[PDB]
Design a protein around this ligand. Structure first.
Ligand SMILES: OC[C@H]1O[C@H](O[C@H]2[C@H](O)[C@@H](O)[C@@H](O)O[C@@H]2CO)[C@H](O)[C@@H](O)[C@@H]1O
Ligand SMILES: OC[C@H]1O[C@H](O[C@H]2[C@H](O)[C@@H](O)[C@@H](O)O[C@@H]2CO)[C@H](O)[C@@H](O)[C@@H]1O
Ligand SMILES: OC[C@H]1O[C@H](O[C@H]2[C@H](O)[C@@H](O)[C@@H](O)O[C@@H]2CO)[C@H](O)[C@@H](O)[C@@H]1O
Ligand SMILES: [Ca+2]
Ligand SMILES: [Ca+2]
Length: 686
């Protein structure tokens, strides 16, 4: 099938996501609605259930609402069984309508539906070419109080109705018993509770295995992607081990939530996105779009910087999920603000790099502050708004114009208020002009593009006051005026004659797994795929088309590789880098080193005998290690993903800048478990 097909669970770049809060979309089946003091059919009390379900979702899909808009994927609330307790948070009653308070991951939330409802959901969606994504939140169970076992459901965890354990008297130690985090350090928000939420302990085998098994069920249910909650609050290594489990079974596009504040830029965030096996919600894009188009606290120059920098910081920028708002911020649209801002920001996001996500009700200009305020019931299914039409006109271009889905980004004109960018992929080009100034037009002269000579109509049809464009020879545009609040899109498409790789997924897996290579100009006859210098052809290439290739990863040694393709005639493609070949199935192991005392600005790292550990390369060492919560300095710890059942040799080191100090003696040695987790404790050899 082509790259754009609904069946492509590895690439969401040509798609447009619609983020839905199940409870607040549509109640197609009142019968499953909760009753009593947990329900509010008026949905005036934003903390109880309003009754939205899967059925309601099916209904909107079938009656043309989402399809009419151009949406091609839907992202919904965590489907698992939540707690039933109404929780009084100082006079206010709170229900689990949000689905973030899990009690059993192998069961559904009856307020949303039955498994059969779920299966119908996927069916209906699929039938209409819409992919399905679900939230997944393995960091915790529910709000619990260690000495007030009667409070809520005491963070109890079940396994398909079977009681695993509770927060009080946690002998098995399923949970963390370290107190609450003050979000002070990365280490602090990982090993402590998020408020009163029962913190799961990924280091306990039971927990480890339970979670890995739970996600398979859903995978077996046919989901197209997973949205991970609180990735920044769980151990990185465990998460990488989780990714491996998914990818080594049934790979699906996975993205996590790692909140970034205004003007915040984190290297940890980059690294996670680059090596964990999942991509992230592009908080950096979001924050910056808001400042520029909404709060007006930065200008075009700032957008431009975020664009060029992110491109450099993320190994796979096109896998970052963009948006303008979501359930964790106030609605972009403000009561009394000019709608044109929300419109401009939608246009922008839609034609920009990444995977655009639209928060339900945006197209309806919903207003609302922070939680619970940004979680109201969509008040209407009108296709008549300007926003609905914007999406409707742009969304489809992600499928038909590869420049938009996979192209580079390039600034071609700019000032404080204006920004003209060019996207390019093969013989495809898209040019976008935005004039944030709602009061002043701009004189546009000196514009050069890669567009062929000719005239171009605004793809928006003038909806946002766009205009036509006249490109002369040399792609130089003739002078024009860009109306105040003006937005225009122009484009050029044509066949690509040379193999050009636009995307790869999954990006990390063991040999034998089939990966997906999307692009253009691959031709129709099988060619060759290169993993590094190793060539793959024939049978192992399970399928080959012009825009997509499916191939089994050869049994090469664990590591990082570049991928490349060559057509049947031997013409080679561009290189796609950063593919990680695992050394085998993975397990999560806690490494602990005793008495490794450092000096300031000097940390301990870990390295060893396998690719998962850097292969003795200090530039690729794991770390820096943690040292405050679980184990206190001078003891250091760290949760690492390693090849299951393999015998491994390792050593700790002290780095400072790029200046290294090795532990003395001989490598330590250990054999990873076949499954479950383990804890290796040793002392620093001087
Ligand atoms: O002529 C190519 C030139 O076009 C754009 O420069 C603009 C500039 O952004 C505007 O602020 C204004 O000064 O007009 C210039 C065109 O004369 C690209 O930004 C620039 O890099 C490029 O060289
Ligand atoms: O908190 C992590 C911190 O640990 C290391 O610093 C040690 C320092 O070397 C010791 O002499 C002692 O004063 O305790 C510090 C930890 O609290 C790393 O040197 C440092 O970079 C790192 O942030
Ligand atoms: O370079 C591969 C080599 O790396 C490690 O050797 C360290 C050694 O442990 C240190 O004491 C120090 O002398 O630097 C060596 C790196 O050149 C592993 O110990 C070793 O097995 C491996 O071959
Ligand atoms: Ca219902
Ligand atoms: Ca945690």
């Amino acid at each position: 099938a082509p790259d754009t097909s609904v069946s492509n669970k590895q690439n969401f770049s040509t798609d447009v996501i619609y983020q839905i809060f199940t409870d607040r979309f549509s109640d197609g089946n009142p019968a499953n609605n909760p009753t009593g003091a947990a329900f509010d059919g008026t949905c005036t009390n934003l903390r109880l259930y309003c009754g939205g379900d899967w059925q309601g979702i099916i209904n909107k899909i079938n009656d043309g609402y989402l399809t009419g808009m151009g949406v091609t994927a839907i992202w919904i609330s965590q489907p698992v069984e939540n707690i039933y307790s109404i929780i009084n948070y100082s006079g206010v009653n709170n229900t689990a309508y949000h689905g973030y308070w899990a009690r059993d991951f192998k069961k559904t939330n009856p307020a949303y539906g039955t498994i059969a409802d779920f299966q119908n959901l996927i069916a209906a969606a699929h039938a209409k070419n819409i992919k399905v994504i679900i939230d997944f939140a393995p960091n915790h169970t529910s709000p619990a109080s260690s000495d007030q076992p009667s409070f809520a459901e005491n963070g109890r965890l079940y396994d398909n109705g079977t009681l695993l354990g509770g927060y009080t008297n946690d002998t098995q130690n399923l949970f963390h018993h370290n107190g609450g985090t003050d979000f002070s350090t990365t280490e602090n928000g990982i090993y402590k509770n998020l408020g009163d939420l029962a913190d799961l302990n990924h280091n306990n085998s039971t927990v480890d295995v339970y979670l890995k098994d739970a996600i398979k069920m859903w995978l077996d249910l046919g989901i197209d992607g997973i949205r991970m909650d609180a990735v920044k609050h769980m151990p990185f290594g465990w998460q990488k081990s989780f990714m491996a489990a998914v990818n080594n079974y049934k790979p699906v596009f996975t993205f996590g939530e790692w909140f970034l504040g205004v003007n915040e830029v984190s290297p940890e965030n980059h690294k996670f996105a680059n090596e964990s096996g999942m991509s992230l919600l592009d908080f950096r894009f979001a924050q910056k779009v808001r400042q520029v188009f909404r709060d007006n606290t930065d200008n075009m120059y700032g957008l431009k910087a975020m664009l060029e920098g992110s491109a450099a910081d993320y190994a796979q920028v096109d896998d970052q999920v963009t948006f303008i708002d979501n359930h964790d911020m106030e609605r972009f649209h403000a009561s009394n603000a000019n709608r044109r801002k929300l419109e401009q920001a939608l246009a922008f996001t839609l034609t920009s790099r990444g995977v655009p996500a639209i928060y339900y009700g945006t197209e309806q200009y919903m207003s609302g502050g922070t939680d619970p305020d940004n979680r109201a019931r969509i008040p209407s299914f009108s296709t008549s708004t300007t926003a609905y039409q914007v999406i409707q006109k742009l969304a489809p271009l992600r499928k038909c114009n590869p420049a938009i889905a996979y192209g580079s980004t390039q600034e071609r004109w700019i000032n404080n208020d204006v920004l003209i960018y060019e996207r390019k992929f093969g013989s495809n080009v898209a040019v976008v002009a935005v004039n944030r100034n709602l009061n002043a037009p701009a004189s546009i002269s000196g514009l050069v593009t890669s567009l062929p000579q000719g005239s171009y109509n605004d793809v928006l049809g003038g909806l946002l006051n766009g205009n036509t464009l006249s490109v002369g020879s040399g792609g130089a545009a003739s002078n024009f005026t860009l109306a105040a609040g003006g937005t225009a899109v122009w484009q050029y498409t044509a066949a690509t004659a040379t193999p050009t790789i636009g995307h790869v997924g999954p990006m990390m897996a063991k040999p034998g797994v089939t990966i997906t290579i999307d692009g253009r100009g691959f031709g129709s006859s099988k060619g060759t795929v290169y993993f590094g210098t190793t060539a793959v052809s024939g049978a192992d290439i399970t399928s080959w088309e012009d825009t997509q290739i499916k191939v089994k990863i050869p049994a090469v040694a664990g590591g990082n590789y570049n991928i490349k393709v060559a057509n049947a005639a031997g013409t080679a493609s561009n290189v796609y880098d950063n593919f990680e070949v695992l050394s085998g199935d993975q397990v999560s192991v806690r490494f602990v080193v005793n008495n490794a005392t450092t000096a300031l600005g000097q940390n301990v790292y870990l390295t060893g005998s396998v690719s998962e550990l850097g292969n003795w390369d200090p530039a690729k060492a794991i770390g820096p290690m943690y040292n405050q919560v679980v184990y206190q300095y001078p003891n250091w710890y760290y949760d690492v993903s390693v090849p299951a059942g393999k015998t491994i040799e390792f050593k700790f080191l002290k780095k400072q800048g790029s200046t290294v100090t090795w532990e003395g003696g001989s490598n330590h040695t250990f054999t990873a478990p076949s499954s479950g987790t383990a804890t290796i404790n040793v002392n620093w050899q001087p």
